[PDB]
Amino acid sequence: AQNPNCNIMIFHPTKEEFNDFDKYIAYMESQGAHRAGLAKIIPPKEWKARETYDNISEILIATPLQQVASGRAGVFTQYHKKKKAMTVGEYRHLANSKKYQTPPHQNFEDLERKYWKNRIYNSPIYGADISGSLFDENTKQWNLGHLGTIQDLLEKECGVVIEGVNTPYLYFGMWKTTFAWHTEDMDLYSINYLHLGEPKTWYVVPPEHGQRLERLARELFPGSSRGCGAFLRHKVALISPTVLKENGIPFNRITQEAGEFMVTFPYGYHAGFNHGFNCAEAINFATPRWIDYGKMASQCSCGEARVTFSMDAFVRILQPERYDLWKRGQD
Ligand SMILES: Cc1ccc(C(N)=O)cn1
Ligand SMILES: O=C(O)CNC(=O)C(=O)O
Ligand code: NI
Ligand SMILES: [Zn+2]
């Protein structure tokens, strides 16, 4: 078996290898990349997402989210407080202000130490889940707005046409902005391109060990667990690498820099944080190997999760027994 220790693998496709997206995902998996839950892909030197990022300041962040923490430094939840709209230019200025800017630090490890020591004592503001794309329409390779759709994948694999669309989302981050432990909706893949700015550090649990993380989460967030059998779907829980190590949870970490892609694989739990002002673009996608994960994906039906329109068809076709209960949760 390839990659038996479930290490995060890093790939350097040539420009020829960068033409066929599906083929390269399959290649990465042939090398065992999916066992980690996360892979990094460094594009060939000849590639670019767009010409410049000089003209993005007028993009609107309609609902910036202030991420307010509760708990202890290594075990906490965060809730999202809605703030007034601001442009990306205004947001960048805010990120760079004394209140929110990245502190002096020696290296990525030093900054990581500072993040887990001090995150809960601040409430950074995130511009997340903004429908849109920063890929030039003329970028033909790994353009996250031009991928084969999940609906077409399901149709190709299972023969049933379904409603729904899937399009990319933009994320404008600042120091300490945080993404909670989660897998994707319906345990889909995701792909994330860091367009511009400071790095993003990722933590990931191998898919074959995801239930170990779930068991620990139930122990660490007991009220949340009683409220919902799938509460990590709420995407609000954080557990530090120190606490994961203390509890013997297998995981890995890696830092993504501007110009790099990350792919998360079905049922690969991940979490992380931004180092400073940045902009990422991400979208979910599927392959034939996803279908079995989609069929088995556990769902939130307590009402907290609240997902996109397109997930309806996924649950309806892949999980008909669960559909009634799940749909009741969506309403
Ligand atoms: C605590 C918890 C959260 C989410 C899930 C899941 N598989 O969706 C399972 N257990
Ligand atoms: O970048 C973020 O804030 C979160 N991204 C993801 O969880 C992803 O790409 O799957
Ligand atoms: Ni994700
Ligand atoms: Zn729930």
Swiss-Prot record:
Q: Which residues form the JmjC domain?
A: 136-302
Domain JmjN per the UniProt entry, residue ranges: 8-50
Protein name according to UniProt: Lysine-specific demethylase 4D
Task: Give the binding site residues for Zn(2+).
Answer: 228, 234, 300, 302
Subcellular localization(s) per the UniProt record? Nucleus
Q: Which GO terms describe its cellular component?
A: blood microparticle; chromatin; nucleoplasm; nucleus; pericentric heterochromatin; site of double-strand break
Q: Which residues carry this modification: PolyADP-ribosyl glutamic acid?
A: 16-17
- Keyword Hydrolase listed? The answer is no
Describe the function of this protein: Histone demethylase that specifically demethylates 'Lys-9' of histone H3, thereby playing a central role in histone code. Does not demethylate histone H3 'Lys-4', H3 'Lys-27', H3 'Lys-36' nor H4 'Lys-20'. Demethylates both di- and trimethylated H3 'Lys-9' residue, while it has no activity on monomethylated residues. Demethylation of Lys residue generates formaldehyde and succinate.
Q: Where does Fe cation bind?
A: 182, 184, 270
- Stated family: Belongs to the JHDM3 histone demethylase family.
Entry note: cofactor: Binds 1 Fe(2+) ion per subunit.
Binding of 2-oxoglutarate occurs at 126, 192, 200, 235
Task: Please write the reaction equations for the catalytic activity of this protein.
Answer: N(6),N(6),N(6)-trimethyl-L-lysyl(9)-[histone H3] + 2 2-oxoglutarate + 2 O2 = N(6)-methyl-L-lysyl(9)-[histone H3] + 2 formaldehyde + 2 succinate + 2 CO2
Q: Mind telling me how this protein is modified after translation?
A: Ubiquitinated via 'Lys-63'-linked ubiquitin chains. Deubiquitinated by USP14 with the help of TRIM14 leading to stabilization.
Q: Give the protein's cofactors.
A: Fe(2+)
Which molecular function GO terms apply here? chromatin DNA binding; damaged DNA binding; histone demethylase activity; histone H3K9 demethylase activity; histone H3K9me2/H3K9me3 demethylase activity; metal ion binding
Enzyme Commission number, as recorded: 1.14.11.66
State the organism of origin. Homo sapiens
- Which biological process, per GO, is one annotated for this protein? chromatin remodeling
What's in the keyword line of the UniProt record?
ADP-ribosylation, Chromatin regulator, Dioxygenase, Iron, Metal-binding, Nucleus, Oxidoreductase, Transcription, Transcription regulation, Ubl conjugation, Zinc
